[PDB]
Ligand SMILES: Nc1ccn([C@H]2C[C@H](O)[C@@H](COP(=O)(O)O)O2)c(=O)n1
Ligand SMILES: Nc1ccn([C@H]2C[C@H](O)[C@@H](COP(=O)(O)O)O2)c(=O)n1
Ligand SMILES: [Mg+2]
């Protein structure tokens with residue numbers, strides 16, 4: 001139907017940085033959450049002009065950005081594009097993906113009105129399975145068991161059928177003509193994704209409410 | 224503990240000025256390891272470039288619903304109002320928030336020092352009042368704090384006049400700050416001011432850092 005889990009009251013834009021690609025059995029190095037209330041997205045300035053300017057982020061937003069020490073080193077390509085490395089994260093005292101972090105995420109999620117839906121670019125094939133794997137290792141139950149999730153790649157394809165590449169930067173350089181900034185950083189890509197999702201907010205929320213599925217159904221990437 | 228491993232740059236937005244007994248509407252924490260500040264490029268030239276933020280940083284920015292309304296002036300500069308905060312589902316300054324802060328501080332290597340502009344007279348006393356309203360024990364009992372006004376006064380006399388956040392930033396870097404009077408914006412501006420002479424700041428923090436437990440509440 002059109003509301004399998006009710007109207008999502010907040011979208012949490014999510015991006016992960018990690019040690020490598022899925023085949024490497026990667027581990028999380030950076031995590032950013034940007035929670036936006038439905039109304040903040042609805043009340044975004046309507047897109048007009050060609051090219052429309054990059055929308056202004058909503059004034060009221062909750063943000064969490066964390067660097068995390070992995071158990072194994074980052075691959076060469078990963079370490080260069082993210083600007084992170086196992087050694088640099090450890091020398092700066094970053095802690096691993098542990099139970100305290102789960103409590104942090106739980107407390108952060110608990111400040112958001114429910115139902116809540118995660119939005120990640122390619123999340124169905126990377127971020128969500130990876131985050132599922134990281135949470136599975138913990139004694140603490142998943143803080144996302146009642147949270148829903150959605151892949152923004154699927155979202156924008158459906159939206160752009162208002163009758164092509166759907167990588168983050170390609171979409172960003174197609175709606176707006178500016179280049180994305182701070183690429184391949186957790187907070188950087190989250191802000192880029194937020195700008196993409198602010199292009200057609202009302203249509204995005206409609207598609208999100210339609211396709212939101214429980215994060216508990218996400219298969220772990222490995223383990 | 225006395226040799227700070229983490230600086231947490233902190234900024235609060237609230238409903239009004241101290242006399243009005245205000246409540247917090249927004250808070251931002253930006254945790255930076257001592258190594259990230261130490262390895263910031265010394266400021267050279269006149270004006271020096273705005274220092275680059277460290278790549279490794281922990282950030283927490285939260286909007287908070289106040290019990291009372293924001294004054295018209297406070298809403299004008301912060302862009303926040305009780306009505307819009309509550310219609311967007313923001314929760315009060317409650318025990319879960321203290322649990323959130325606790326877990327955030329737990330991820331930072333100790334000892335840890337809060338850095339806030341005008342903190343001794345505003346942010347730290349106000350934050351002590353919000354936390355004393357909770358049954359949950361204060362999660363800042365054990366962390367240290369310091370006011371960046373006093374810091375920048377000492378660093379600027381070292382060589383050789385307003386100390387508002389904007390004034391300092393503009394005097395040091397010859398341009399206007401961005402996103403003034405927002406929690407995250409003023410934190411990033413404060414970071415830039417503190418990255419001016421980081422070695423000298425860290426040394427000055429170690430000598431003047433003070434336990435948050437000693438901060439006197441603002442009211443109540
Ligand atoms: N050439 C690449 C591209 C991506 N990644 C992995 C590491 C990144 O942390 C993760 C997420 O990609 P992105 O930085 O685009 O968010 O994918 C990688 O290992 N090598
Ligand atoms: N002219 C001003 C300046 C500040 N404040 C209050 C509300 C602000 O949220 C808080 C913090 O000020 P600032 O935006 O400088 O951090 O002090 C105010 O009411 N009126
Ligand atoms: Mg991504």
Ligand SMILES: [Mg+2]
Pocket residue numbers: 015016017183184185186189
């Ligand atoms: Mg990324």
Ligand SMILES: [Mg+2]
Pocket residue numbers: 234235340341346409
């Ligand atoms: Mg201030």
Ligand SMILES: [Mg+2]
Pocket residue numbers: 234235236403404405406409
């Ligand atoms: Mg401020």
